[PDB]
Structures are given as C-alpha cells and as structure tokens.
Amino acid sequence: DLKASSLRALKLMDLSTTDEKVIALCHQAKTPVGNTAAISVYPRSIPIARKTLKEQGTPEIRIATVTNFPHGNDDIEIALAETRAAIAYGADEVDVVFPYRALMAGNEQVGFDLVKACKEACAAANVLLKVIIETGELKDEALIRKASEISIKAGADFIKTSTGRVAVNATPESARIMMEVIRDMGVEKSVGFKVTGGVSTAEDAQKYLAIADELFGADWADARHYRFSASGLLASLLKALGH
Numbered sequence: 498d499l500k501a502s503s504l505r506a507l508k509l510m511d512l513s514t515t516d517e518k519v520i521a522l523c524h525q526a527k528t529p530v531g532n533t534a535a536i537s538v539y540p541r542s543i544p545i546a547r548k549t550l551k552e553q554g555t556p557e558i559r560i561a562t563v564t565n566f567p568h569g570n571d572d573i574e575i576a577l578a579e580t581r582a583a584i585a586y587g588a589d590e591v592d593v594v595f596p597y598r599a600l601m602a603g604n605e606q607v608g609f610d611l612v613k614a615c616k617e618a619c620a621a622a623n624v625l626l627k628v629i630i631e632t633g634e635l636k637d638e639a640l641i642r643k644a645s646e647i648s649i650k651a652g653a654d655f656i657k658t659s660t661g662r663v664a665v666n667a668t669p670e671s672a673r674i675m676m677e678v679i680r681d682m683g684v685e686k687s688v689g690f691k692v693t694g695g696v697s698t699a700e701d702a703q704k705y706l707a708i709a710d711e712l713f714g715a716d717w718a719d720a721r722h723y724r725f726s727a728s729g730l731l732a733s734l735l736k737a738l739g740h
C-alpha cells in the first residue's frame with residue numbers, strides 16, 4: 498500500500514532545503530497530510546526556524562542541525578564546540594559527521610572519542626545525537642559495520658548513512674547493513690536509523706521502510722527510530738497521496 502507507506506515516510510522526514518529559505522522550509526514541513534518529524538538547518542538558522550515553527554502552530558516539529566559537517570574531520574575539539582553551539586542555539590537534534598577518513602586510516606579510537614564527547618554534550622541538554630558515518634565514502638561492508646558499531650558504543654542515538662554532500666549516499670544495501678548492526682548489537686530500543694539521499698521516490702521510501710519492518714517488526718520505525726531526508730522526496734510522497 499504505497500499511500501500508507503508514503504504517509505508513514507512523510508511523518509519520518511527530516512526535511513531540509515537566507516531567512517526566507519528557512520521560513521519556507523518550515524512552511525513546507527507543515528503539509529496537508531501532516532507534519533514531517535523534523536526540519537534540518539544549519540545551526541545559525543535554529544532561532545528563526547523555532548520562531549517560525551511556533552508562529553505556524555507546529556511547535557512539535559523537531560529542529561535538527563549538523564556539526565563536524567560535511568567533512569567529518571577528526572578534530573574532537575572543533576566537533577564538540579560546534580555541537581555545544583548547536584545545542585545553545587536551541588537544536589532538538591544534532592547530526593554529527595563521524596571521522597570516517599580517520600577510521601579508514603585505522604584510527605577507531607578518535608571516532609569513539611569524538612562521538613562520545615558530542616553525545617555527552619547532547620545528553621546533558623536532552624538533545625538527540627545522530628551520527629553520519631558516510632557509507633558512500635567508507636564503501637566497504639566491514640567499514641560500514643565498524644563505524645556503526647563505534648558510533649553505537651560511543652552513545653549514538655541514531656546512525657545515519659550520509660551527509661548528502663558526496664557522490665554516493667544511501668543505498669538499500671548500506672541501509673540494510675546499518676540496521677543489521679543495530680539488531681546484532683541488540684540496541685534497537687535505543688538506536689534509530691536515518692536514510693539520507695538515495696530515496697527520491699515514494700516507491701524508494703517504501704523499500705527502505707520494508708527493510709526495517711522485516712528486521713524489527715512493523716511497529717519499530719517510529720520517529721524515535723527512523724528518519725528520511727532526500728531532495729525531491731517530499732514532493733514524491735505528496736504526489737503519491739494525491740497532493
């Protein structure tokens with residue numbers, strides 16, 4: 498049932514694209530069939546987004562942002578400072594980029610320490626931390642699993658495929674691998690999964706949700722455990738739903 502999956506996917510979106518653009522994003526998040534789970538903006542845009550969401554009567558739409566982004570550099574102090582600033586701006590959620598090049602160079606420890614430091618900041622402010630591992634740069638299945646594992650161990654609240662800023666973003670395969678790690682680690686209660694990119698259409702979204710359904714059961718993928726972001730996806734979902 499494409500309509501049923503499209504509605505579910507819509508309510509799982511972190512919708513992402515000046516003040517005019519932020520304000521328009523917020524408006525777009527309030528759709529005729531429901532609200533997206535969140536909007537995603539740069540940290541500096543959080544205050545104006547919060548005001549806009551409030552003014553339009555959608556205060557429960559979450560505000561997510563990005564730090565250590567999009568590079569995934571291995572400077573913990575910079576990543577942490579950015580994350581504290583995101584929090585101070587008013588983020589509900591911070592999507593931090595894992596130091597994936599460092600892991601490809603054999604340094605697992607800095608990924609652990611970077612995620613942990615950011616998680617600690619987030620948790621003290623009741624902010625969720627997503628960790629972007631950049632599956633499209635890691636490429637290798639074992640590296641995708643290791644990055645996922647290190648992120649979970651360090652306290653990620655979500656593991657996320659991609660920044661959306663490299664040539665290769667989510668695929669069904671990388672999504673499967675990452676959700677298999679959640680399952681294999683036994684952390685499906687505490688750790689969500691987010692697809693970024695590779696999900697252009699309603700039909701695509703249905704497939705991604707089906708993976709989660711098959712691994713965890715059909716009730717698992719609520720907004721605390723599953724999110725989507727991709728250019729064009731909202732329009733495709735709305736079209737499936739007749740808008």
Ligand SMILES: *C/C=C/c1ccc([N+](=O)[O-])cc1
Nearest residue numbers: 513537538539563592660693
């Ligand atoms: C995973 C989040 C990616 C992303 C890209 C761009 C923006 N933005 O335009 O604010 C937010 C989040």
